XYZ file of C-alpha atoms in Angstrom:
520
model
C -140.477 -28.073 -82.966
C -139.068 -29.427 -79.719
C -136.663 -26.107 -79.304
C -140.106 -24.364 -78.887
C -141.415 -27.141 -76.329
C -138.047 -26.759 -74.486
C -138.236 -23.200 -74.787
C -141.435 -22.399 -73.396
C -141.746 -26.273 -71.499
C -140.102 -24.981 -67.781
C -140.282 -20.970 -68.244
C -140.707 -18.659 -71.127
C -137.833 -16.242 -70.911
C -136.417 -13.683 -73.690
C -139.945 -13.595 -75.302
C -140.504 -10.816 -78.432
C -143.806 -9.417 -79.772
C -143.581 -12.123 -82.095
C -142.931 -14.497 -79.762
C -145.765 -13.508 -77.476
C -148.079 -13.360 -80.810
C -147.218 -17.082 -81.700
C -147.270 -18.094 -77.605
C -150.512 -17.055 -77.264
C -151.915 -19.197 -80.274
C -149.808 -22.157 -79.550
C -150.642 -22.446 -75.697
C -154.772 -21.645 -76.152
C -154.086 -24.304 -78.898
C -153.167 -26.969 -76.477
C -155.135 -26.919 -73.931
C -158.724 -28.928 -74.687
C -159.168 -29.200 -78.883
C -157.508 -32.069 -79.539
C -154.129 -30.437 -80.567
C -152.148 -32.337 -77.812
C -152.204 -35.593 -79.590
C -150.770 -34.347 -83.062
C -148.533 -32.682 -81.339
C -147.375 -35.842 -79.522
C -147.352 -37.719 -82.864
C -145.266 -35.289 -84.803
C -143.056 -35.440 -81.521
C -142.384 -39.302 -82.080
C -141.211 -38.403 -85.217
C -137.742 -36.221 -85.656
C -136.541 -38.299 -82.489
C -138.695 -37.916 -79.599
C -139.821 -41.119 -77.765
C -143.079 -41.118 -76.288
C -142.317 -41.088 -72.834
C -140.433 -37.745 -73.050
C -143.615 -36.567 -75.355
C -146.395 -36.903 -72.804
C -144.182 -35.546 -70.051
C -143.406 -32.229 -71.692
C -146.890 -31.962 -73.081
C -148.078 -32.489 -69.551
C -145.691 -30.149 -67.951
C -145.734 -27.629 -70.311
C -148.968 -26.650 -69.519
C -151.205 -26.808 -66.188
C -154.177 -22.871 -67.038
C -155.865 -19.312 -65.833
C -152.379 -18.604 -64.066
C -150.495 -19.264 -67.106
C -152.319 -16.405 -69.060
C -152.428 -14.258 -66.020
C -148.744 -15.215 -65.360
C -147.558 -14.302 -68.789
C -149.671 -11.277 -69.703
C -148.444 -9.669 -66.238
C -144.969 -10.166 -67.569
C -145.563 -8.687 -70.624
C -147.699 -5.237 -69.117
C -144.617 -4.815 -66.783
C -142.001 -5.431 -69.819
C -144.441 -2.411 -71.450
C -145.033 -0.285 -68.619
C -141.306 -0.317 -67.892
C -140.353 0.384 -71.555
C -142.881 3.344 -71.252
C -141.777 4.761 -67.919
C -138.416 6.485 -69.342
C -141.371 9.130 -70.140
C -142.890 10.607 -67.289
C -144.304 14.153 -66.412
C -146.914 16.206 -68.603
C -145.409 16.921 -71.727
C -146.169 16.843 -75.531
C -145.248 13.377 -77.095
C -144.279 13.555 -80.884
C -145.220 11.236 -83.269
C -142.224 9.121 -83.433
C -142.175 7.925 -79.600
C -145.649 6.435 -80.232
C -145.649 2.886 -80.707
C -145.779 1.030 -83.908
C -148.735 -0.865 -85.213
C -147.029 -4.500 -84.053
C -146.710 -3.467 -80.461
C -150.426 -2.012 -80.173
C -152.179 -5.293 -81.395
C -149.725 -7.295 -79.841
C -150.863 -5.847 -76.219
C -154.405 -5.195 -78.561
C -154.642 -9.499 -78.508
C -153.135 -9.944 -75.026
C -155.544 -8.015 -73.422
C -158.178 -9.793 -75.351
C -157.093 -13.306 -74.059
C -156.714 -12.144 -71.015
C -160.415 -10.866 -70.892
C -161.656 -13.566 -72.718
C -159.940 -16.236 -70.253
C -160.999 -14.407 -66.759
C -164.377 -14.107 -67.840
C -164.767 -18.039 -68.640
C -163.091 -18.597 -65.461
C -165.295 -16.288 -63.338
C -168.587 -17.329 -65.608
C -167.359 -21.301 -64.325
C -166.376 -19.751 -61.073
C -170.412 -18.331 -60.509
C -171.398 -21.812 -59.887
C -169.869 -23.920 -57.011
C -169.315 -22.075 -53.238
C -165.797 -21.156 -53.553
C -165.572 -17.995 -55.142
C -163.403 -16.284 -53.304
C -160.134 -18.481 -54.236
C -159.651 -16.280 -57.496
C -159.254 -13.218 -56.023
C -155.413 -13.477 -55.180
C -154.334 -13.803 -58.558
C -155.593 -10.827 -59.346
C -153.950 -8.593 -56.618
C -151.581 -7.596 -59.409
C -153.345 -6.824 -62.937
C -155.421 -3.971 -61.270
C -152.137 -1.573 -60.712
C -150.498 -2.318 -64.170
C -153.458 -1.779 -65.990
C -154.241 1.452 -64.136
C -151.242 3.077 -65.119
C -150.745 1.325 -68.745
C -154.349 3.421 -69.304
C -153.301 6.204 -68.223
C -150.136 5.756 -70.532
C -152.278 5.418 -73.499
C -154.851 8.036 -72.796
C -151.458 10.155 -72.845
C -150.706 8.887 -76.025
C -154.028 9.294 -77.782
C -154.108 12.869 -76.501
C -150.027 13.311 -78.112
C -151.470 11.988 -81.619
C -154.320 14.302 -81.551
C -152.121 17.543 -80.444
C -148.905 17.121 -82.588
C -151.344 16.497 -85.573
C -152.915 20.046 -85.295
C -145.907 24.738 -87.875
C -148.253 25.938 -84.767
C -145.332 26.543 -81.913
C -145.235 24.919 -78.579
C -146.517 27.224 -76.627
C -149.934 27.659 -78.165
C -150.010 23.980 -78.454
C -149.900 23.875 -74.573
C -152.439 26.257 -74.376
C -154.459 24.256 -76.574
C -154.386 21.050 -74.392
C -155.044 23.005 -71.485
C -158.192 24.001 -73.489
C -159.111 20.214 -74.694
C -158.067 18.756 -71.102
C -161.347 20.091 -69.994
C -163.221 19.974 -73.064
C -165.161 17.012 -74.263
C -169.451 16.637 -74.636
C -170.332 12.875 -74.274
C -170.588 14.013 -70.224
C -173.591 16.032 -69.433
C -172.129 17.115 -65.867
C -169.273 20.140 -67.481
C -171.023 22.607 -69.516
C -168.063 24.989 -70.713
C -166.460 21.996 -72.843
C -168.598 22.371 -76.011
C -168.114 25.732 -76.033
C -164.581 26.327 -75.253
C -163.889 23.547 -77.990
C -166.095 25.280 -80.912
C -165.049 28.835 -80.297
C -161.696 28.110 -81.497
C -161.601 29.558 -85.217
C -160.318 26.582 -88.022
C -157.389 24.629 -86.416
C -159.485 22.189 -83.876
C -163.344 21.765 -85.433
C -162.261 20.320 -89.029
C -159.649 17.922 -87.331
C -161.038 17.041 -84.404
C -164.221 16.503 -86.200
C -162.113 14.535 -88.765
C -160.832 12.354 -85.597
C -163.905 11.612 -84.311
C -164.991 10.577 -87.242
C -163.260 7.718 -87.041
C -165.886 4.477 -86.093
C -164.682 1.206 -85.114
C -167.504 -0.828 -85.773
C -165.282 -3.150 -87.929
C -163.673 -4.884 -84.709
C -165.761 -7.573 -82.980
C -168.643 -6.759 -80.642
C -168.476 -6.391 -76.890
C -169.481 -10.216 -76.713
C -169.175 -11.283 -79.642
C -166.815 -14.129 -78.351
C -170.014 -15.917 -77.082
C -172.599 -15.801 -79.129
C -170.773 -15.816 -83.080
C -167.603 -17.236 -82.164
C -168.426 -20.036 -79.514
C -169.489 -22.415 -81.996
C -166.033 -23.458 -83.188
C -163.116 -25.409 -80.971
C -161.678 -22.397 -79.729
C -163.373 -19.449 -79.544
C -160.340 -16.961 -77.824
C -158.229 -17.780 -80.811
C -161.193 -16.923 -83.499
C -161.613 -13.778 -81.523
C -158.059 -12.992 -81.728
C -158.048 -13.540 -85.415
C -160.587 -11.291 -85.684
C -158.947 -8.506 -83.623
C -156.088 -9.013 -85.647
C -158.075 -8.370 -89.235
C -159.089 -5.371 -87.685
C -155.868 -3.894 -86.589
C -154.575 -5.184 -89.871
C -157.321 -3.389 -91.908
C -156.618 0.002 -90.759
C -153.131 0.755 -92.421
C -155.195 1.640 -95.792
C -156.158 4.624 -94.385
C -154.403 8.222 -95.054
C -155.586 10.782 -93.299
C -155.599 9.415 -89.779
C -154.628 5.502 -89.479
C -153.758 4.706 -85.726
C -156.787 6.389 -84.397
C -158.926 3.422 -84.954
C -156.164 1.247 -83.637
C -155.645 3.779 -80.255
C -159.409 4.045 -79.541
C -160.299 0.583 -79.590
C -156.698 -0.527 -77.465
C -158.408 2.408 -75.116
C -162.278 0.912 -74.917
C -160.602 -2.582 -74.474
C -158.084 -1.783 -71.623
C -161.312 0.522 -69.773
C -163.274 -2.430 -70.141
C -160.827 -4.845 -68.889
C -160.478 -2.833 -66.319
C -164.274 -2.285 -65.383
C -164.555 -6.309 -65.504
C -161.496 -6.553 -63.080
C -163.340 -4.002 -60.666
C -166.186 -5.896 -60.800
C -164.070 -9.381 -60.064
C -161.471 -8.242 -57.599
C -162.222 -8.717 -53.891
C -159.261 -5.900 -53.228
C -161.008 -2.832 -54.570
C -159.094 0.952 -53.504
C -160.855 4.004 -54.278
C -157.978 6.884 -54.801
C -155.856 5.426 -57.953
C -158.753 4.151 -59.744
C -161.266 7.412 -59.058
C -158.069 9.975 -60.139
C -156.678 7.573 -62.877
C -160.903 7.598 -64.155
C -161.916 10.795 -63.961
C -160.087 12.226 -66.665
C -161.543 10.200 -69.145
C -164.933 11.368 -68.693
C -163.745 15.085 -68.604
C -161.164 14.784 -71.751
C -162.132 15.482 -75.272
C -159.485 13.560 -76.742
C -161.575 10.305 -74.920
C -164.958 10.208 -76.245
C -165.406 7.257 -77.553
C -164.581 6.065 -74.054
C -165.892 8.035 -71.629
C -169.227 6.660 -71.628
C -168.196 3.011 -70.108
C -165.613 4.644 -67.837
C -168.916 6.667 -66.270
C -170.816 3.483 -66.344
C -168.272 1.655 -64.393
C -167.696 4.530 -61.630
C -170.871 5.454 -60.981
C -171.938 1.764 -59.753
C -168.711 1.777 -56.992
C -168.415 5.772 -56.549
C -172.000 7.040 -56.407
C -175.376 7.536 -58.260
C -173.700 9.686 -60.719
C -176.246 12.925 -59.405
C -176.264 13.241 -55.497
C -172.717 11.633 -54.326
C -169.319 13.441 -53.986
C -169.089 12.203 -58.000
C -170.801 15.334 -58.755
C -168.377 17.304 -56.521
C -165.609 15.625 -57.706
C -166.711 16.759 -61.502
C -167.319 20.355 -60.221
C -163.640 20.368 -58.688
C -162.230 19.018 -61.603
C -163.687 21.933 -63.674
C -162.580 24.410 -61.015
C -159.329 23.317 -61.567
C -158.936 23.275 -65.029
C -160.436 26.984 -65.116
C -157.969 28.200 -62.472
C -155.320 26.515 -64.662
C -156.123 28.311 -67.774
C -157.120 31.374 -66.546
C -153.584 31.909 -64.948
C -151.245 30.216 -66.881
C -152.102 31.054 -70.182
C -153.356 34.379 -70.183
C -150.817 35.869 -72.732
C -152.614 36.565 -76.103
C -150.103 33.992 -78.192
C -150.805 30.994 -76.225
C -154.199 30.398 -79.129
C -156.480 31.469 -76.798
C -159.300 33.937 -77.503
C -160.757 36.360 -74.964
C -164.223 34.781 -75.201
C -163.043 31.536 -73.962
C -161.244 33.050 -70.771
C -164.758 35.555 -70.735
C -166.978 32.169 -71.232
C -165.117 30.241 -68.280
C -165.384 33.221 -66.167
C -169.234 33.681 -66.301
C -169.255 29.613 -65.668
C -167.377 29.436 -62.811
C -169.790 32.909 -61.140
C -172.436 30.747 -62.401
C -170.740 28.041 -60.128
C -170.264 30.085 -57.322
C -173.966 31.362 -57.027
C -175.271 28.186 -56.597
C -173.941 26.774 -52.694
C -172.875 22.977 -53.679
C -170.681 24.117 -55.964
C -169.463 27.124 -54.059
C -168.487 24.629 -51.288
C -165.753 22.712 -53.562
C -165.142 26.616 -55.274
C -163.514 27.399 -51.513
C -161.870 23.810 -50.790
C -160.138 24.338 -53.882
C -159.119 28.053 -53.601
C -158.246 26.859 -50.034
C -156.168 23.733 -50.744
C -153.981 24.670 -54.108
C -156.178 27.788 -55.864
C -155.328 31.626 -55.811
C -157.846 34.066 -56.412
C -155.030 36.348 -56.667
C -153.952 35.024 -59.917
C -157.106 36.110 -62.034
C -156.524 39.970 -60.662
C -152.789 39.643 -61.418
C -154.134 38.032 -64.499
C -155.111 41.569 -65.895
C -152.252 43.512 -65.274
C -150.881 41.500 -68.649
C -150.766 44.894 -70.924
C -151.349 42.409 -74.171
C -154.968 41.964 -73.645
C -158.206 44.552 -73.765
C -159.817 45.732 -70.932
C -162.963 43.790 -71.637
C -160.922 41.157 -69.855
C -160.065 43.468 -66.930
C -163.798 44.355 -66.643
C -165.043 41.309 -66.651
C -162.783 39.855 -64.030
C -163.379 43.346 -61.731
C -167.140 42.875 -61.717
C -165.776 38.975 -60.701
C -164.980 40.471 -57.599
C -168.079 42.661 -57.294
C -170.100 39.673 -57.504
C -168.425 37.389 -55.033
C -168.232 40.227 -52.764
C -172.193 41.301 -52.968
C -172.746 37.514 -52.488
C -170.548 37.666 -49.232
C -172.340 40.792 -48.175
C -175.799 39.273 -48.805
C -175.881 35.545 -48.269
C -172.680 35.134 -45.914
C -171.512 31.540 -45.286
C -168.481 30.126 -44.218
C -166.849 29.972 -47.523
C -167.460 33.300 -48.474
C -165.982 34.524 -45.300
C -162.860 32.683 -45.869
C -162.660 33.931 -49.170
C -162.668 37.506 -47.865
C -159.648 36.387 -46.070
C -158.158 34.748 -48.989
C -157.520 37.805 -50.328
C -154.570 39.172 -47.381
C -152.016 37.559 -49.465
C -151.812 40.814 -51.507
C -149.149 41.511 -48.743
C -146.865 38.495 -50.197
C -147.298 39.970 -53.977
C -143.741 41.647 -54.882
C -143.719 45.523 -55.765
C -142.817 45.468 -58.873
C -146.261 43.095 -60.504
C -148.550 44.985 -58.179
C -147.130 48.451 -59.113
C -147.615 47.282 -62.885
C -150.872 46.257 -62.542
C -152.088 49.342 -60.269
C -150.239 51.690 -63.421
C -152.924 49.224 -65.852
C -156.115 50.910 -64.509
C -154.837 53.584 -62.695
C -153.211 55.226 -66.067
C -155.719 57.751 -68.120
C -156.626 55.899 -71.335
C -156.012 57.960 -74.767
C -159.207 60.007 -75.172
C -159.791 58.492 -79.014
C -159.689 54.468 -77.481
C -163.264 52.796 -76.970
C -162.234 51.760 -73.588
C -162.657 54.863 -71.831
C -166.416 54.012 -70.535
C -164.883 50.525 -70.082
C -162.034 52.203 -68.057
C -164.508 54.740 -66.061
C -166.796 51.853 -64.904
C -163.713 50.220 -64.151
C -163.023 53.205 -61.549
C -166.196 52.959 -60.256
C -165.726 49.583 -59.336
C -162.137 49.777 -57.982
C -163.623 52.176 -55.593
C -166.778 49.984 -55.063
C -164.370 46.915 -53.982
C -162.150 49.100 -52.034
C -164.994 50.151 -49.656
C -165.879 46.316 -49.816
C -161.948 45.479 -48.367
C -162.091 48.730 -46.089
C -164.869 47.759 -44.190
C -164.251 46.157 -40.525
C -167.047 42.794 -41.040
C -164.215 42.354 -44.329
C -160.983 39.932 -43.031
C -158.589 40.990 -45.352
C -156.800 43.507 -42.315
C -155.525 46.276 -42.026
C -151.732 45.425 -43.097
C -153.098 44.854 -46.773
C -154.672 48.623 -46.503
C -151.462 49.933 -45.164
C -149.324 48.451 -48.021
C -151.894 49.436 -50.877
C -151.523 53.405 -49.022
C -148.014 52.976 -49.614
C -147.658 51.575 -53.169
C -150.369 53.934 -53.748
C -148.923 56.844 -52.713
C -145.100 57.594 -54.984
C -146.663 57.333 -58.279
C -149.326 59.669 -56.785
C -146.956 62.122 -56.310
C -145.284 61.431 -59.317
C -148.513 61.779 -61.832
C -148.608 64.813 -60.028
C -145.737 66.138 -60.532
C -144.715 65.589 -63.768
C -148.278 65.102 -65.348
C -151.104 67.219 -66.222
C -153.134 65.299 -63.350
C -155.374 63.219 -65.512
C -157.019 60.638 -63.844
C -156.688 62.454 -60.435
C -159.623 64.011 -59.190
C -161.141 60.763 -58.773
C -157.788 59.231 -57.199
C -158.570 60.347 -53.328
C -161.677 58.273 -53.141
C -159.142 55.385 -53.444
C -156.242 56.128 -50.778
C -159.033 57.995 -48.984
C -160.835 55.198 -47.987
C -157.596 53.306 -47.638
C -156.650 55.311 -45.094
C -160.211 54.985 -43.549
């Protein structure tokens, strides 16, 4: 009708989904197929002479910044809808989109893919290429952060589906977060992922299950679908049947609709990358590297490798690998503190698992390098041993994480390098601990075990290497100081007296090598 040519002739305000789904049919329609004339003619009819016709048709459309214009519009219409939710927090169900809104963006971003690739594939002939950079300087940003928006998403649906309480299921993203397989460079994933007993093997294996082989190839729209008039709009038809076809399902329905929004808006992306003169690193590395590293992106993660390891490095000797290695770091710092009470779903083989990883890690010296950035810039090896003093869990846990310090420390003694060195120093923030957490965990080993618990050679080997690593801090070459010592004598020395006096002495005969050395 001429209320639509008048409504979209000059500008195209107060669009709706609907209104962008019939906009972007309408204006590919118009544009070299042979629509323009019918249009015209049914124009002369209901009162339009031509003259006004073939103005409005030739105004109403001019092409490339039209899409680019519009589609813009729309991602910053989403991205501000979306931004009223910010933070890391669990999404429920209900604030994730409905179907219309994901293949409405679902068939934007597919125009807008389709269109910059005929314009670049055009744009490889001729010697000005470098006049289509500019009107990209926008999409790059707004895609960025509408991924990372729906990688959030896509990790909400797969948590809430898992009544399980909130706490555990923080616990259990902090476990997927660093899970995932389709990367070879992480090694714990697999493992941390299958240990857990029933709740995420059945459904996640139930998720990723889900194939979405029924949407159109990668370029399909140029080989199959070329043929016709218009080949974006039989491509969007297409994209549409498949988003359509997925509502019959029951168990699961918007996964196939959320991974292949995900693949499309990483590939978009990639393609932009390669097009865009303007290229910068830090938003696009950090808002990429979780998608290699996350199991809730798997699908995915293979094209988002493909596409940073041509701008970022080889993929095996550049800082990528680094990068990865930090990332893990990070993730087992985070889990191994923050999560260390027994109800948060996690089993003591995963935090024993990431532990013997991240030694692993720290043996070899390219690793250990990132191991003491990381402990240097935001890690605390303090955490792990305050970790223990957590009365909830066995002393398997406590054991393992003492002959943790052993290790690092017969590595310093043996093979001493500048990390290791200021890792010994790391450690003189015991003086900053409060009284009360370091008294509690000194009464954890320090206190006899009952004589009928299994723990008790656990407990003794435990003295042994209390005493080992105190005669590691004691010695001058250490640079933990002698302020730490002092302290430690004098948080050591009341409950001393006190086990003393009003106990039987268990537990003390082996006491003075402790505060003896201390004091040495």
């Amino acid at each position: 009708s001429k209320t639509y040519i008048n409504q979209l002739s000059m500008n195209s305000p107060e669009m709706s989904e609907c209104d962008i789904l019939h906009t972007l049919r309408w204006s590919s329609r118009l544009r070299i197929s042979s629509y323009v004339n019918w249009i015209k003619d049914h124009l002369i009819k209901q009162g339009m002479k031509a003259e006004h016709a073939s103005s409005l048709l030739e105004l109403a459309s001019t092409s490339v910044k039209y899409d680019v214009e519009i589609v813009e519009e729309y991602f910053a219409r989403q991205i501000s809808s979306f931004c009223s939710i910010d933070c890391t927090t669990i999404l429920q169900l209900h604030e994730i989109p409905s179907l219309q809104s994901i293949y409405t963006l679902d068939a934007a971003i597919s125009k807008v893919q389709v269109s910059l690739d005929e314009h670049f594939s055009k744009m490889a002939a001729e010697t000005d290429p470098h006049k289509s950079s500019e009107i990209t300087k926008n999409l790059l940003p707004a895609t960025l952060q509408l991924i990372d928006t729906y990688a959030s998403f896509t990790r909400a649906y797969l948590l809430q589906n898992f009544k399980p309480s909130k706490e555990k299921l923080q616990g259990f993203a902090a476990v997927l977060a660093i899970g995932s397989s389709r990367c070879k460079a992480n090694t714990l994933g697999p493992t941390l992922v299958q240990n857990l007993p029933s709740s995420v093997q059945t459904v996640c294996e139930s998720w990723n299950n889900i194939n979405t082989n029924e949407f159109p190839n990668i370029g399909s729209w140029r080989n199959a679908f070329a043929n016709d008039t218009i080949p974006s709009e039989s491509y969007i038809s297409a994209v549409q049947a498949a988003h359509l076809g997925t509502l019959c399902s029951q168990s699961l329905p918007l996964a196939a609709s959320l991974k292949h929004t995900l693949l499309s808006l990483v590939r978009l992306t990639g393609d932009l990358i390669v097009w865009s003169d303007e290229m910068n690193p830090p938003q696009v590395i950090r808002t990429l590297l979780p998608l290699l590293l996350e199991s809730s992106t798997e699908s995915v993660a293979e094209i988002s490798s493909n596409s940073l390891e041509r701008i970022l490095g080889p993929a095996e000797s550049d800082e990528f690998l680094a990068r990865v290695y930090e990332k893990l770091i990070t993730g087992c710092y985070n889990i191994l503190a923050n999560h260390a009470d027994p109800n948060s779903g996690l089993d003591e083989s995963i935090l024993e698992e990431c532990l013997q990883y991240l030694e692993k890690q720290l043996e070899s010296s390219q690793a250990r390098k990132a191991m003491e950035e990381f402990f240097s810039d935001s890690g605390e090896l303090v955490q792990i041993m305050m970790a223990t003093a957590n009365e909830n869990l066995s002393a398997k846990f406590c054991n393992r994480v003492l002959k943790f310090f052993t290790k690092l420390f017969q590595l310093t003694e043996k093979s001493p390098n500048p990390s290791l060195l200021h890792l010994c120093g790391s450690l003189a923030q015991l003086a900053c601990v409060e009284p009360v957490r370091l008294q509690a965990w000194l009464t954890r080993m320090t206190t006899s075990p009952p004589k009928d618990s299994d723990q008790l050679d656990v407990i003794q080997e435990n003295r042994q290497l209390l005493q080992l690593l105190t005669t590691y801090i004691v010695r001058e070459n250490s640079q933990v100081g002698e302020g730490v010592c002092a302290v430690l004598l004098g948080t050591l020395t009341p409950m001393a007296t006190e086990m003393l006096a009003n106990g039987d002495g268990t537990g003390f005969p082996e006491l003075m090598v402790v505060m003896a050395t201390l004091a040495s």
